[PDB]
Design an enzyme around this catalytic site. Structure first.
Site, PDB file in Angstrom:
ATOM      1  N   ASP A  21       0.849  -1.193   0.000  1.00 62.11           N
ATOM      2  CA  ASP A  21       0.000   0.000   0.000  1.00 62.11           C
ATOM      3  C   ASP A  21       0.890   1.250   0.000  1.00 62.11           C
ATOM      4  OD1 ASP A  21      -1.894   1.994   0.376  1.00 62.11           O
ATOM      5  OD2 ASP A  21      -2.278   1.501   2.476  1.00 62.11           O
ATOM      6  N   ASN A  23      -0.724   4.649  -0.120  1.00 62.24           N
ATOM      7  CA  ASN A  23      -1.504   5.841   0.189  1.00 62.24           C
ATOM      8  C   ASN A  23      -2.245   5.718   1.520  1.00 62.24           C
ATOM      9  OD1 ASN A  23      -3.511   4.010  -0.702  1.00 62.24           O
ATOM     10  ND2 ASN A  23      -4.814   5.711  -1.379  1.00 62.24           N
ATOM     11  N   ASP A  25      -4.489   3.666   2.801  1.00 58.41           N
ATOM     12  CA  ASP A  25      -5.876   3.248   2.984  1.00 58.41           C
ATOM     13  C   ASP A  25      -5.963   1.794   3.449  1.00 58.41           C
ATOM     14  OD1 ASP A  25      -5.204   1.830   0.703  1.00 58.41           O
ATOM     15  OD2 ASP A  25      -6.892   2.558  -0.487  1.00 58.41           O
ATOM     16  N   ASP A  29      -1.732  -1.430  -3.747  1.00 59.18           N
ATOM     17  CA  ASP A  29      -2.064  -0.760  -4.996  1.00 59.18           C
ATOM     18  C   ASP A  29      -0.977  -0.944  -6.053  1.00 59.18           C
ATOM     19  OD1 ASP A  29      -0.066   1.305  -4.050  1.00 59.18           O
ATOM     20  OD2 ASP A  29      -1.687   1.721  -2.632  1.00 59.18           O
ATOM     21  N   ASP A 199      -9.503 -17.711 -14.807  1.00 56.30           N
ATOM     22  CA  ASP A 199     -10.215 -18.093 -13.595  1.00 56.30           C
ATOM     23  C   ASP A 199     -11.279 -19.165 -13.917  1.00 56.30           C
ATOM     24  OD1 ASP A 199     -10.703 -17.509 -10.721  1.00 56.30           O
ATOM     25  OD2 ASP A 199     -12.667 -16.850 -11.443  1.00 56.30           O
ATOM     26  N   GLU A 253      -6.997 -22.039 -14.993  1.00 57.47           N
ATOM     27  CA  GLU A 253      -7.193 -22.560 -13.647  1.00 57.47           C
ATOM     28  C   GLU A 253      -8.254 -23.629 -13.857  1.00 57.47           C
ATOM     29  OE1 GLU A 253      -9.832 -20.544 -11.010  1.00 57.47           O
ATOM     30  OE2 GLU A 253      -8.813 -21.311  -9.215  1.00 57.47           O
TER      31      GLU A 253
HETATM   32 CA   LIG Z   1      -3.553   1.732  -1.281  1.00 55.96          CA
END
Ligand SMILES: [Ca+2]
Length: 556
Positions: A21, A23, A25, A29, A199, A253
């Site tokens: 991460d 930022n 939150d 990301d 998937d 998969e």
């Molecule tokens: Ca983030």
């Protein structure tokens, strides 16, 4: 000829949501992943497979896509994606994206239109049916709880969803739908993506008439869902209309499918998929209800690998993985995560992973030796699948909340989703805020920063194994032969190619063990060993193994 780059490559799976991460939150990301490319490159990774990164309401963390042509808000913008692409290229690395087209989000515009009326142009982009005998169309159960049929009062019919209620299945029997999916794939491929992971690729074809599953099929409904009559016809078409025009590798998969049908998906002559993700091994000790465990031994482990390898034949190809985002941590699952054995067994599993015939996929964190998480209450899980188990087993009185907890703690997908452990700072350096999923407390001992500078760390062992694999053709495209499928103590096998033969010996017991090489076989050189006080003498005919010892040797 020559083997494709993907057959000699070492992939790394990144679960963006829990990687890095940037930022605060609490959610990983793109910028975070992009900032860590030097880390992956240094590890020796050739390509990365990232889980779903498209716009999604996240009822299933990315697997419920509301717009296949937009990036997930949490991960960044299209620009961030382009940047990831450019940075991977600057380092000579390739990207494999996740393709989720067995279903979409119920918030996708196709579904919003589909449910409006029976005569709507998008009605058949999904499966709508009338209930029967006062109930659902049939007895189909959902992987995530209750019936796979949800009634929509807007029309009065039920729509199909093998997974979440907010994940309606796409109707591959509809030509215009298939054309839309193909155009969608071209959208990403035109951007330069080097690979696509499909998937639940074996569930695209639905059974005509939707008859009830027999009592037996109900026990293993996942397998029944892979028996659609138009499955390979659809896969061959997708290949013909899309992949035939690009140079990207495809990996399916193939979940729930009988191993004997796998060749249909990967035999290169069939022009369907390039590589196979099978689950016979990773689910080799999982009960049919998917939340209980069943004790197995190394014998079961090796024999399963045996069969899976045999299935590849001469024209097929397997991927090899010991962990992913849908299963418990590798070392906890196949090794021994206790403090005194965690590191030794994690290295042993690495040796296995990187010496298997096929394209190995390393799941983020396993190179560190990360383990399962110590769940304390059912509230500690985020996984929608666990809520499904509660609905199907707790609220129905089949099991107590405590019994679900006790068992699901060992199998839950969340074990693999706790934040990657970068260092020993707040929340293992994953975020400066509050992680969407609690970090494993053992991050104070298990973290990248501590292992990167230590020659004896699990990380360094992986790195060295990766270099050895990259420098030894036989260890990737070489043949594979199990020395003794019945041995439940020491896993031993050879990899051969153009005369050069290598021996892999891994002790799966936390006790000393001996290993006698096959008659006529002798050690020539020792490439590497873990938990070994001394390499064998050149010309050796046997080996004395320390607990969880592993090794790669060139023989003669
Ligand atoms: Ca983030």
């Amino acid at each position: 000829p020559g083997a494709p780059w993907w057959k000699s490559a070492v992939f790394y799976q990144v679960y963006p949501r829990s990687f890095k991460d940037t930022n605060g939150d609490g959610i990983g990301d793109f910028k975070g992943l992009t900032e860590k490319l030097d880390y992956l490159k240094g590890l020796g990774i050739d390509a990365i497979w990232i889980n779903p990164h498209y716009a999604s309401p996240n009822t299933d963390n990315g697997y419920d896509i509301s717009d296949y042509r937009e990036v997930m808000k949490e991960y960044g913008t299209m620009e961030d994606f382009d940047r990831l692409m450019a940075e991977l290229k600057k380092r000579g690395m390739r990207l494999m994206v996740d393709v989720v087209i067995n279903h979409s989000s119920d918030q996708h515009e196709w579904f919003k239109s589909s449910r409006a009326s029976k005569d709507n142009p998008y009605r058949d982009y999904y499966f709508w049916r009338d209930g029967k005998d006062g109930h659902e169309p049939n007895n189909y159960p959902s992987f995530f709880g209750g019936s796979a049929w949800e009634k929509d009062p807007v029309t009065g019919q039920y729509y199909l969803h093998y997974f979440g209620r907010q994940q309606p299945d796409l109707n591959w029997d509809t030509p215009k739908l298939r054309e839309e999916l193909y155009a969608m794939l071209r959208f990403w491929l035109d951007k330069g993506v080097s690979g696509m992971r499909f998937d639940t690729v074996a569930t695209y074809s639905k059974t005509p008439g939707f008859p009830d599953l027999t009592p037996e099929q109900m026990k293993n409904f996942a397998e029944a869902y892979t028996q659609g009559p138009n499955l390979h016809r659809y896969l061959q078409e997708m290949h013909e209309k899309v992949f035939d025009h690009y140079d990207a590798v495809t990996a399916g998969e193939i979940f729930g499918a009988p191993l004997n049908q796998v060749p249909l998906f990967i035999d290169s002559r069939r022009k369907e998929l390039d590589m196979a993700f099978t689950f016979d091994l990773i689910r080799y000790d999982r009960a049919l209800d998917r939340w209980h465990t069943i004790p197995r031994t190394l014998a079961d482990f090796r024999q399963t690998i045996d069969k899976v390898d045999a299935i590849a034949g001469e024209y097929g190809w397997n991927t090899f993985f010991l962990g992913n985002h849908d299963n418990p941590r590798a070392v906890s699952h196949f090794g021994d995560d206790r403090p005194q054995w965690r590191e030794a067994s994690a290295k042993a599993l690495a040796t296995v992973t990187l010496t298997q015939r096929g394209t190995p996929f390393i799941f983020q964190g396993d190179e560190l030796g990360m383990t399962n998480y110590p769940f304390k209450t059912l509230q500690d899980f985020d996984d929608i699948e666990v809520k499904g188990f509660f609905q199907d087993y707790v609220e129905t009185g089949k099991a107590t909340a405590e019994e679900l907890l006790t068992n699901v703690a060992l199998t839950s997908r969340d074990n693999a989703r706790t934040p990657f452990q970068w260092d020993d700072s707040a929340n293992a350096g994953f975020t400066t805020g509050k992680p969407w999923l609690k970090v494993n407390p053992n991050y104070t001992e298990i973290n990248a920063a501590r292992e990167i500078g230590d020659p004896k760390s699990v990380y360094s062992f992986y790195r060295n194994l990766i270099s050895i694999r990259h420098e030894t053709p036989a260890l990737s495209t070489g043949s594979y032969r199990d020395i003794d499928p019945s041995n439940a103590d020491v896993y031993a096998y050879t990899r051969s190619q153009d005369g050069e033969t290598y021996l892999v010996v891994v002790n799966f017991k936390a006790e000393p063990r001996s290993f006698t090489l096959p008659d006529g076989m002798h050690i020539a050189e020792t490439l590497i060993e873990s938990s070994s006080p001394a390499a064998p003498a050149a010309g050796a005919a046997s080996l004395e193994l320390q607990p969880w010892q592993s090794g790669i040797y060139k023989v003669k």
